[PDB]
């Protein structure tokens with residue numbers, strides 16, 4: 119049995135594993151990581167925990183009755199263990215049956231999810247590679263993170279903006295005087311990366327503090343970002359940020375402070391927005407006092423902030439929770455409108471940035487080459503012959519339950535109309551929709567429309583528990599791969615070396631899909647005649663050739679593999695100022711909008727005629743909001759990202775012991791809200807509204823503002839009885855309480871943070887948690 123050390127990486131960073139007798143026993147952070155995540159110990163434990171999936175399983179009802187199975191019992195744990203050969207034969211026959219019977223519109227292959235990094239073992243791209251060979255599939259578009267912002271930005275500034283490099287951290291340290299974290303908690307959300315993280319935000323944040331820059335945080339919760347800086351903390355009622363921004367803009371106009379020259383030369387449509395702001399159009403001037411009545415933030419604080427931003431070099435760093443809500447498109451559109459009025463866009467240290475809290479945005483980029491990986495093949499095909507009727511081949515990701523309930527119905531998206539396809543099977547890998555999607559009770563019933571549901575994962579999540587066919591995948595630590603370090607920085611390239619042998623009967627997603635492609639008669643087309651190391655070497659060799667051209671020297675493949683990593687040099691990346699060339703000469707360097715300027719009023723959006731997405735930033739009432747007129751429930755739930763998980767990942771590990779309260783997901787509650795209900799620290803409470811009910815464990819703190827409770831997304835849904843409609847969730851999946859609606863007709867984004875509920879001390883019968891041990895038949 120092996121003894122020794124091996125270096126690899128993950129969504130949480132680079133590390134060295136210690137192996138003793140063939141088992142990994144410690145993960146130690148990379149010596150060059152400036153700020154390792156405390157979640158690394160849970161990553162190691164996820165390889166071996168009680169919920170690791172050991173064998174291929176088929177739901178007993180599905181095995182016995184196929185398409186005639188009773189579909190309401192999915193999730194009760196009644197599984198049968200089968201051999202790999204039987205399982206692969208069944209999956210392959212079901213994929214082919216559905217493709218022949220219903221066409222490519224019958225298979226949903228969107229499979230949204232965070233999976234693991236790795237250019238070769240990219241389970242979702244491998245899924246689409248196989249489905250392409252099978253005849254086609256319906257895909258998803260956009261994502262759950264910036265579903266609204268990524269669609270409105272191209273109409274305002276011309277590009278996506280949210281996933282683009284920010285003005286560099288060192289430029290901010292030398293030039294910014296006031297830094298604003300608006301609906302952003304960079305300390306919390308910078309621990310992970312899509313590719314391997316370099317944790318570049320931490321040194322950037324430390325340099326701002328050492329310089330004594332004034333930091334302001336606008337967030338209903340007193341986060342570690344607030345605590346690290348001793349920041350001035352503004353706490354708006356959730357979903358009222360647009361009203362605050364309008365009251366700031368109104369103040370800048372009334373006191374005649376705003377930058378008229380910036381507005382005149384770099385923007386379009388401000389004259390059509392002004393009348394709205396002043397109340398000429400609706401008899402309601404959007405003053406600081408009007409904003410105070412909606413948001414609860416004192417009118418004079420709103421005014422002082424507006425003056426301060428106008429007089430100092432200010433960076434408006436905004437996060438994404440405020441656009442993960444009804445009418446989310448207005449939040450960042452109004453933010454950019456406010457930034458335009460301040461006139462600092464394109465100056466070193468000023469303007470705005472939408473990715474300082476995500477994957478190291480602002481960390482200086484190197485001059486290295488880009489690494490490429492396996493593809494789904496669609497780019498070199500001639501896929502399905504598609505046409506309306508059968509419906510759209512792509513849907514906005516968060517409309518997956520609407521699609522299932524309304525096959526053939528039309529939906530709007532960014533100015534076009536499309537039809538939902540009639541899906542009969544879904545194949546999910548690397549994602550956990552029975553945790554990540556909204557309105558769980560609705561989704562549970564809608565899922566009965568699917569004949570067949572196949573899932574691959576290495577943990578028994580609620581999604582795998584609901585499958586008809588469950589196949590055990592390996593982790594990244596049981597295979598070899600290659601990946602970039604740094605989504606924006608491109609710090610280097612890492613060899614993700616195998617640490618231990620595959621556990622139990624687990625197989626990589628690549629091997630499972632290759633075996634399904636082989637039964638479809640298309641094995642060589644899937645594999646390309648290459649094995650694991652052959653694929654990895656060809657990605658490396660391609661990057662090395664690109665590197666050569668550009669003057670970046672890289673070692674041959676085997677020398678790179680022996681070292682385990684290659685790092686690239688930073689040339690001018692540390693001086694990058696976003697929008698500087700636009701500011702310097704807007705005629706030579708225009709934005710990619712219809713006018714070539716920042717569009718405060720959009721004629722294009724005006725033509726779409728959407729009632730829920732007007733042609734300029736607008737305050738509109740959401741479905742439900744804290745203290746809204748006629749609101750039924752009293753507390754807003756901040757259903758934000760978990761500090762000690764990556765969404766649902768790591769919930770079934772030893773780290774859960776450090777935050778669970780009586781075994782359940784924690785609920786943070788203000789002392790006065792607790793006292794009014796007779797709730798004490800540590801009590802189990804029932805959190806409920808008209809869509810669902812869950813149990814959580816309370817931690818009483820004044821870190822959350824009064825009227826707000828914090829229950830993070832990601833908890834593993836553990837239903838008392840899958841056949842009972844609206845059954846109680848014993849663990850605390852906050853998406854049992856959210857509503858499943860689009861942000862607007864423009865983007866159709868999810869509204870996972872538009873949530874109100876009531877809380878009461880739980881006094882019902884004691885409950886047994888069953889989500890963190892495998893189903894009995896899977897032991």
Ligand SMILES: NC1=NC(=O)C2=N[C@H]3C(S)=C(S)[C@@H](COP(=O)(O)OP(=O)(O)OC[C@H]4O[C@@H](n5cnc6c(=O)[nH]c(N)nc65)[C@H](O)[C@@H]4O)O[C@H]3NC2=N1
Pocket residue numbers: 262263264300301302303306307308309310336337338339341354355356357358359436437438439440442475476756757758759760761762763764765871
């Ligand atoms: N540790 C960690 N775990 C993760 O699961 C994780 N997920 C990653 C992903 S996939 C993404 S897309 C990014 C998401 O990054 P994003 O900015 O969406 O993160 P959230 O945790 O949803 O919200 C950030 C802050 O917004 C505050 N907030 C909520 N509602 C409001 C509001 O109405 N107004 C204001 N002003 N603030 C509000 C919350 O209290 C929270 O502190 O995080 C990434 N980083 C992650 N880190």
Ligand SMILES: NC1=NC(=O)C2=N[C@H]3C(S)=C(S)[C@@H](COP(=O)(O)OP(=O)(O)OC[C@H]4O[C@@H](n5cnc6c(=O)[nH]c(N)nc65)[C@H](O)[C@@H]4O)O[C@H]3NC2=N1
Pocket residue numbers: 230231232233234239241262263264442547548549550551553554555574575576577579591592593594627757758759764765766767831852853856870871
């Ligand atoms: N209410 C609410 N508020 C929110 O703020 C919120 N955030 C949204 C956001 S921004 C996103 S990005 C989504 C995230 O939702 P997402 O489904 O991406 O969440 P994860 O828990 O990372 O699911 C990843 C799954 O892939 C598995 N996996 C990892 N590697 C592999 C592999 O190699 N092979 C296979 N077969 N499986 C693998 C993991 O074990 C895990 O179960 O949540 C969204 N949901 C949200 N809801």
